[PDB]
mmCIF file of all heavy atoms in Angstrom:
data_model
loop_
_atom_site.group_PDB
_atom_site.id
_atom_site.type_symbol
_atom_site.label_atom_id
_atom_site.label_comp_id
_atom_site.label_asym_id
_atom_site.label_seq_id
_atom_site.Cartn_x
_atom_site.Cartn_y
_atom_site.Cartn_z
ATOM 1 N N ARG A 3 9.906 -20.443 -13.681
ATOM 2 C CA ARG A 3 10.269 -21.036 -12.403
ATOM 3 C C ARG A 3 10.868 -19.944 -11.542
ATOM 4 O O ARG A 3 11.810 -19.273 -11.970
ATOM 5 C CB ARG A 3 11.297 -22.144 -12.597
ATOM 6 C CG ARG A 3 10.832 -23.282 -13.483
ATOM 7 C CD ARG A 3 9.804 -24.149 -12.785
ATOM 8 N NE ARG A 3 9.463 -25.314 -13.591
ATOM 9 C CZ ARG A 3 10.234 -26.388 -13.704
ATOM 10 N NH1 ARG A 3 11.390 -26.443 -13.060
ATOM 11 N NH2 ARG A 3 9.852 -27.404 -14.462
ATOM 12 N N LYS A 6 14.919 -18.850 -5.329
ATOM 13 C CA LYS A 6 14.774 -18.812 -3.882
ATOM 14 C C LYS A 6 15.822 -17.888 -3.286
ATOM 15 O O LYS A 6 17.021 -18.082 -3.489
ATOM 16 C CB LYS A 6 14.876 -20.216 -3.291
ATOM 17 C CG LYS A 6 13.727 -21.106 -3.722
ATOM 18 C CD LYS A 6 13.783 -22.483 -3.125
ATOM 19 C CE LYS A 6 13.357 -22.463 -1.694
ATOM 20 N NZ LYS A 6 11.943 -22.046 -1.614
ATOM 21 N N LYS A 14 15.801 -23.852 2.182
ATOM 22 C CA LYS A 14 16.159 -24.911 1.269
ATOM 23 C C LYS A 14 17.546 -25.423 1.587
ATOM 24 O O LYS A 14 17.793 -26.631 1.562
ATOM 25 C CB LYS A 14 16.088 -24.411 -0.167
ATOM 26 C CG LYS A 14 16.333 -25.507 -1.166
ATOM 27 C CD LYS A 14 15.256 -26.562 -1.039
ATOM 28 C CE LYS A 14 15.393 -27.602 -2.114
ATOM 29 N NZ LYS A 14 16.695 -28.302 -1.947
ATOM 30 N N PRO A 17 21.978 -26.482 6.849
ATOM 31 C CA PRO A 17 22.379 -27.839 7.208
ATOM 32 C C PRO A 17 21.305 -28.524 8.009
ATOM 33 O O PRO A 17 21.000 -28.102 9.120
ATOM 34 C CB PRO A 17 23.637 -27.613 8.041
ATOM 35 C CG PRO A 17 23.465 -26.282 8.575
ATOM 36 C CD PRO A 17 22.807 -25.486 7.538
ATOM 37 N N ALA A 30 26.849 -39.878 25.988
ATOM 38 C CA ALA A 30 27.289 -40.861 26.978
ATOM 39 C C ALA A 30 26.836 -40.428 28.362
ATOM 40 O O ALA A 30 26.558 -39.248 28.594
ATOM 41 C CB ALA A 30 28.806 -41.004 26.943
ATOM 42 N N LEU A 38 33.467 -35.928 45.835
ATOM 43 C CA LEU A 38 34.839 -35.481 45.950
ATOM 44 C C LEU A 38 35.026 -34.702 47.243
ATOM 45 O O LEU A 38 34.082 -34.084 47.734
ATOM 46 C CB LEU A 38 35.235 -34.589 44.766
ATOM 47 C CG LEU A 38 35.305 -35.126 43.336
ATOM 48 C CD1 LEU A 38 34.013 -35.737 42.849
ATOM 49 C CD2 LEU A 38 35.662 -33.988 42.428
ATOM 50 N N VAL A 45 42.580 -25.357 58.902
ATOM 51 C CA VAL A 45 43.136 -26.126 60.011
ATOM 52 C C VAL A 45 44.651 -26.101 59.957
ATOM 53 O O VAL A 45 45.306 -25.758 60.947
ATOM 54 C CB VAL A 45 42.612 -27.572 59.997
ATOM 55 C CG1 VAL A 45 43.348 -28.418 61.018
ATOM 56 C CG2 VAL A 45 41.126 -27.579 60.283
ATOM 57 N N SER A 46 45.211 -26.410 58.797
ATOM 58 C CA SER A 46 46.635 -26.244 58.576
ATOM 59 C C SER A 46 47.448 -27.081 59.529
ATOM 60 O O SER A 46 47.998 -26.541 60.488
ATOM 61 C CB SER A 46 47.043 -24.787 58.745
ATOM 62 O OG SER A 46 46.840 -24.360 60.078
#
Side-chain angles (χ1 to χ4, degrees):
Chain A
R3 300 287 186 77
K6 294 182 76 64
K14 185 62 174 63
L38 295 57
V45 172
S46 65

